[PDB]
Design a protein around this ligand. Structure first.
Ligand SMILES: O=c1[nH]cnc2c1ncn2[C@@H]1O[C@H](COP(=O)(O)O)[C@@H](O)[C@H]1O
Ligand SMILES: O=c1[nH]cnc2c1ncn2[C@@H]1O[C@H](COP(=O)(O)O)[C@@H](O)[C@H]1O
Ligand SMILES: OC[C@H]1O[C@H](O)[C@H](O)[C@@H](O)[C@@H]1O
Ligand SMILES: OC[C@H]1O[C@H](O)[C@H](O)[C@@H](O)[C@@H]1O
Ligand SMILES: O=P([O-])([O-])F
Ligand SMILES: O=P([O-])([O-])F
Lengths: 830, 830
């Protein structure tokens, strides 16, 4: 059937009776009233049963051996569905497929019923999810720590061509994967004040919110390792949230509990944008305060909570603990670690600071100013009084370090301050993370260089040893084996299965680049993929596309820096050229654009409306025929990505050079048989470097050119004046060609493009369409297109998150990865 | 061990492996980290497994056979713990006791970990719980319908002698008994307006709240019948509760969902008191609207949703459906049934009314005015516009009926109106229920007569056939076998086990009233019970009592009509008599008073403070010694009642004659070996009638005397003037003898007692203490006391809820009870 494992006789029979046990005892249903949703749950519970045994021994193991622990703190974990992925990592897919088949059910139909775990916005949240999978696969004693939002990223609906947001009630029917652990509930404090008495400061008169943990198993790829992702949920204490007496109403007091619990109610839908709301800050401290108590409790036990030197010596803390900060969102972990050590454990400042800097590391994901977290001091002052004091003290000593290193450099002092003066005083969270971490890394080579040359130049000059790079990667399990079994199978037929956990082995596919059967096969799976997607389209969304055309797809969050607008300009150019010479041959294309816009991002929402508006015109022009279709992919999410990526021919990574830190979707497309058209930005550089620039469609300005233009001054009018085709498009938008009933509908886009384009769309226009003509030319030669595809796939090995994680482990965490199978799952009951 | 069933070889082994399966696969724990709470859950899940098979066939059965369905609507279901009760009804107690013992665990210790399901206030909510158990035991196709509050009755804490209320988070650790059924979620409407168009009225522009059901199994006693209790939970739609666009905030919209969901957040802590809040009215309609749609869906299928006459003829509706209204709380079911039939199904008014009156029946529980539900019209007008219109129309036609029957009786017309004029117009919910029901019943003989003679006299004259009586009862399973196995065992030793489902058989115990061994045994189990309670007291609450003393206990909600104050007066009298003649012998007593006061009931809370204040003085007077102790039983609830009742010697049922509708705690004490001191009120009359007045301690005014006094005019000063002992007590309270630091602390109680005593405490004082002297005299003669106890126990059979339910079934519902074992639980999987 494929290498989805063995469909053993004993195990298919075992799976079937357990499926029936659950459908009866767990779901309390009988075959006669069972619906596909019930069947999905019976299966999910049956599959979950297979990893509890391994989950228990993995955790018991870490307790016995006591290795260095890796804590990955993140406010986002973009998990997606977990049924298939669990089957894949446990080599259960074929057995389950067989068993359900014999039960008379279609497994693929049941998989579609699982709701996505959309506790993420985009790139940052998915990275965390890919990292978790890789850390388990590399046998690291790693824990994912976050917030269990009851509402993840909103579900996007397109009404009248506009995005409509609606609550994502992903827990509506229940989550069979998580395990509530009310017994490990912890208290988290807010507000209060600081008392300075005799031997130390005291955080007093605080409001208490409880953090209840929920554990979800994270299985490694076929190694019997099942790590843990602990997600915190907010709960109100039943005392003060009722007991602070003297009138108000008993009923009201109980109803007001949903004020402390709102902390974990919903994820902020912002991607690469900072919003200074109090609720966000509370979420950020909530996850940090709860996680750290857990981290210290585990350390106090270790082997020190037995003997060792005997005396809670936190000197070994950094040898037993490593906490990675996914962006600055969990940055309060630094001053919180200091507060505990100094205020509670009573260590001297300097010893505590040494420990804190040695266990913390920070990962930066963007260079755009609006994405940077700068919290107003009055907010920190009211909500976290003691943390503000600790931050001021950290700033004081850090700045003394700078003054001592750069005597008389008074401007450098204000530039590096953690405290920003002006309208309102703010705390620069990024400066805080650099100061309190022993490592700071970028997510792609060029991004990491940009951090050193620009944004964090002063900090780099002070401590050059702190700055590193760790190019992002994606997990080949979910992004290859799970979503594209067809491609995984033909690769396995030639080079075996070891590449699934050793992606570098794909290089061996280079020797089949002239193999006639392989070229035919690679080309065949892509065609089968396109046919399946074209079908899904009519199934769930309804209104035909042509599977023979070039599948041009750009899927990512809607942003001005990602330039979906530059894509739009090309689409309109194609349309106008066809209308000018209707009976001339052009390579057919289906251009699909998908992605979500943050609710308050007006420009992003206006761009989604432009895309649909273009589709309204293009898709109904008889002269165009089937040569050009414009489709907006609704509700782009992880499970949707697993469907479009394997079906793409062209991947669009066209952000303005220097703005996309790394990008990971690009990697997903490369490993799945899509060719890439993009700018020398983010990881695109490393990908073209790996496959060879000849097998990549690079165009536009390089970082240097963008800077040259800024010195000069960007004037869009110039481009408008010298390019008739561009002029024609802007006048079409301006006059209502794409919006008849509301002719001035797109005035904000035209106005922006002409007068305030921060990402110089017009400057890359000419080179972009010229380059697009080149991919069309190559698509006309199926054999050469496929041969170039093989060159990309065979060279994508470097972009596996196993490689990224191995580097983090060795160069930052100080731990050694291991592909050693944990001692089976075998029963056991001590 | 006892007749807790057989501890079979095959089954104890089966129980043990399943206990381990759950502890591993369900709880995801290993013996090395498992706590008593984990062990309790492993067991609960193991026991729950045994009734899912029976639950599924019971429900499938009712679908095949299609009998008349009984729907018991109630806003309160005071369930308590469900582990032991399930074991008892499934004959699993000894097997589980053995199995856990072999696992090295104490089952009794694990049972104490289960949280009570306190979704009730007192008498009314517990009645519903006892009824559910009896309906299952009598094989009726009955469904309990209510609200799944996430916070039940508050947990009472005594601080400084004052009651402190704290949220009852009973779901904190999860509920292993319920089964969420998100697939049967239903919509409920609120607000909106009424459009009158061409062919009928339309309820339009409403706000939608979803009702998600949760089913809990209700097993009958050893007959394989497992009925269902469906509890609704409020959920917000993800559309409008987000989709009603045009600014407000995406985040705020999601947080505001907890506004629709507050409907099922908390139970109103009022016992026999009406509070006209909007949130209460919403709860009342919510349970009614959701339940009815379910009822009609089930009817539309039946055998009509196949063939029958073919044409949705609702003429047979009353033949297939019976809905019982537990008080007026679910009274909106009447106008809601009319709305659906008339507005949606399009039946003519008269046909619809005939159907509604024929399927609905109402149960009244109190005669006090402040307990009566009178909803302001402006509230109904805004929240339920169409229901107000239907109510006005029902009133119009009903009053025409009255005018036609009593020509010219213009006062009768205003008295019987469903609409009350005055300050604010109100709807009298009780008048609504009488008009729209074919049966109205009291809960005790005297209460039912009082309804006919007083409160509902006009309605009785109009339709005498509607008024019935159904004396309350309690379930002998939880209130005898479960809480007092020792007593159940010695009864079984002489007359067998058939009395558990045929309580009348206890009469056979009358022939052992002179049996020397039985007297000794009855007396022995009571002593063992007292010793166990005296122990629990020091275990969980801490500060000694004497098990040889007379256990004087009054446990019920704190009310002025229940007269805990009259009890207090006696306690103080005993104290003063001892202090007057210290070296005189008096029968030792431990008087325990327990119960909760509604949060806003100032007088009730002042009474709890008086009780503790008396204890502060009495319990620390060296001259008193161990002859008199005053203890306030904290957090009185179902699980606490199962502990005190079996240990009581004297039961206090001293409400003012004519105020306690029935009472059920009295019945609990009688069946468990306690003698009763009380007034001729509620069921007390029927109990003294059954055991013989000579075996009952009756005192005080009869209903007639109370009325005579009211004609005359009650003057407390008179009693104060002629009774020195009474005078001495009032002056003690007035001068601060019981409150030194705050001498005027009890001025409100004294003021009330002297000037506004609605329940004439002083009028029954003399006869009450005189009577109390008589029980002391009899307690001095152990043999005669026990012989009288046997006379009560042997004659308590009439007070089983099986008898009550059989009468409801025959005289109201039109169904026949059946003690037929359903065809085993046996596997099966169609
Ligand atoms: O005190 C202990 N004794 C025995 N095993 C323990 C103890 N603490 C943790 N463990 C084991 O380690 C796993 C890790 O627990 P955690 O990391 O503290 O959440 C547990 O589920 C147990 O198997
Ligand atoms: O349409 C049907 N076909 C077969 N069995 C049904 C059907 N509807 C209800 N049942 C059975 O009746 C039980 C009662 O369901 P309910 O009373 O509608 O909640 C179900 O769990 C099924 O066993
Ligand atoms: O590092 C993970 C991701 O974080 C953010 O989403 C960045 O915008 C993206 O470039 C990067 O790939
Ligand atoms: O009918 C059940 C119970 O309802 C109320 O609680 C009444 O006050 C009580 O007398 C009665 O026993
Ligand atoms: O949106 P991206 O693929 O750059 F993360
Ligand atoms: O409180 P009661 O026992 O009358 F129900």
């Amino acid at each position: 059937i494929s290498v989805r494992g063995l469909a053993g006789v004993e195990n298919v029979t075992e799976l079937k009776k357990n499926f029936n046990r659950h459908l009866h005892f767990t779901l309390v249903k009988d075959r006669n009233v069972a619906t596909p949703r019930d069947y999905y749950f019976a299966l999910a519970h049956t599959v979950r049963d297979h990893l509890v045994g391994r989950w228990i021994r993995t955790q018991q193991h870490y307790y016995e051996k006591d290795p260095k622990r890796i804590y990955y703190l993140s406010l986002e974990f973009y998990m997606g569905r977990t049924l298939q992925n669990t089957m894949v990592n446990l080599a259960l897919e074929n057995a389950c497929d067989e068993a359900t088949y014999q039960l008379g059910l279609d497994m693929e139909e049941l998989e579609e019923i699982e709701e996505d775990a959309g506790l993420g916005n985009g790139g940052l949240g998915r990275l965390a999810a890919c990292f978790l999978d890789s850390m388990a696969t590399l046998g690291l004693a790693a824990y994912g720590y976050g917030i269990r939002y009851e509402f993840g990223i909103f579900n996007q609906k397109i009404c009248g061509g506009w995005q409509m947001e609606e609550a994502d009630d992903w827990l509506r029917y229940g989550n069979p994967w998580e395990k509530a652990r009310p017994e490990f509930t912890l208290p988290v404090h807010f507000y209060g004040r600081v008392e300075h008495t005799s031997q130390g400061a005291k955080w007093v008169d605080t409001q208490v919110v409880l953090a209840m943990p929920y554990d979800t198993p994270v299985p490694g790829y076929r190694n019997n390792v099942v790590n843990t992702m602990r997600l915190w949920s907010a709960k109100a204490p039943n005392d003060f949230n009722l007991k602070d007496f003297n009138v108000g109403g008993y009923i009201q007091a109980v109803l007001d509990r949903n004020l402390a619990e709102n902390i974990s109610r919903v994820l902020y839908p912002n991607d690469n944008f900072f919003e200074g709301k109090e609720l966000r800050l509370k979420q950020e401290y909530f996850v940090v305060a709860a996680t750290l108590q857990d981290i210290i409790r585990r350390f106090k036990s270790s082997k020190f909570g037995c003997r060792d030197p005997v005396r809670t010596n936190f000197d070994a803390f950094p040898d037993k603990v490593a906490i990675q900060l996914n962006d600055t969102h969990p940055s309060l972990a630094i001053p919180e670690l200091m507060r505990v050590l100094v205020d509670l454990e009573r260590l001297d400042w300097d010893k505590a600071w040494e420990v804190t800097v040695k266990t913390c590391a920070y990962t930066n994901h963007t260079v755009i100013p609006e994405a940077l977290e700068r919290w107003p001091v009055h907010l920190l002052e009211t909500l976290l009084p003691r943390h503000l004091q600790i931050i001021y003290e950290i700033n004081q000593r850090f700045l003394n370090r700078v003054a001592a290193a750069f005597p008389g450099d008074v401007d450098r002092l204000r530039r590096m301050s953690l405290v920003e003066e002006g309208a309102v005083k703010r705390i620069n969270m990024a400066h805080l993370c650099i100061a309190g971490s022993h490592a700071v890394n970028g997510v792609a080579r060029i991004h990491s260089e940009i951090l050193k040359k620009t944004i964090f130049k002063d900090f780099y000059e002070l401590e050059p040893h702190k700055f590193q790079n760790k190019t992002n990667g994606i997990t080949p399990r979910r992004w290859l084996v799970l979503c594209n079994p067809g491609l995984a199978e033909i690769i396995a037929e030639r080079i075996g299965e070891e590449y699934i956990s050793d992606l570098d082995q794909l290089r061996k596919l280079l020797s089949y680049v002239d193999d006639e059967a392989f070229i035919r096969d690679v080309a065949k799976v892509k065609q089968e993929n396109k046919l399946k997607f074209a079908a899904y389209l009519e199934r769930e969304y309804k209104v035909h596309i042509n599977p023979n055309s070039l599948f041009d797809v750009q899927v990512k969050r809607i942003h001005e820096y990602k330039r979906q607008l530059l894509n739009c300009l090309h689409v309109i150019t194609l349309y106008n050229r066809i209308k000018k010479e209707p009976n001339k041959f052009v390579v057919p294309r289906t251009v699909m654009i998908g992605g979500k816009a943050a609710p308050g991002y007006h420009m992003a929402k206006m761009i989604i409306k432009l895309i649909t508006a273009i589709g309204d015109v293009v898709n109904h022009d008889p002269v165009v025929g089937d040569r050009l279709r414009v489709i907006f992919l609704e509700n782009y999410r992880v499970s949707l990505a697993e469907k479009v990526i394997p079906a793409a021919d062209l991947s669009e990574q066209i952000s303005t050079a220097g703005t996309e830190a790394s990008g990971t979707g690009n990697m997903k497309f490369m490993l799945n048989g899509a060719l890439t058209i993009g700018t020398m930005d983010g990881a695109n550089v490393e990908m073209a470097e790996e496959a060879g620039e000849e097998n990549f469609f690079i165009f536009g300005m390089r970082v240097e050119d963008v800077d040259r233009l800024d010195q000069r001054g960007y004037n869009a009018q110039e481009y408008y004046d010298r390019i008739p085709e561009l002029r024609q498009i802007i006048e079409q938008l301006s006059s209502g060609f794409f919006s008849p009933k509301q002719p001035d509908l797109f005035k904000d886009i035209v106005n922006m493009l002409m007068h305030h384009d921060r990402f110089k769309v017009f400057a890359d226009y000419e080179e972009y369409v010229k380059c697009q003509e080149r991919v069309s030319a190559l698509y006309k030669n199926p054999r050469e297109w496929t041969r170039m595809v093989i060159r990309n796939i065979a060279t994508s090995g470097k972009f596996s998150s196993d490689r990224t994680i191995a580097q983090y482990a060795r160069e930052i965490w100080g731990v050694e990865p291991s592909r050693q199978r944990l001692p089976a799952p075998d029963e056991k009951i001590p």
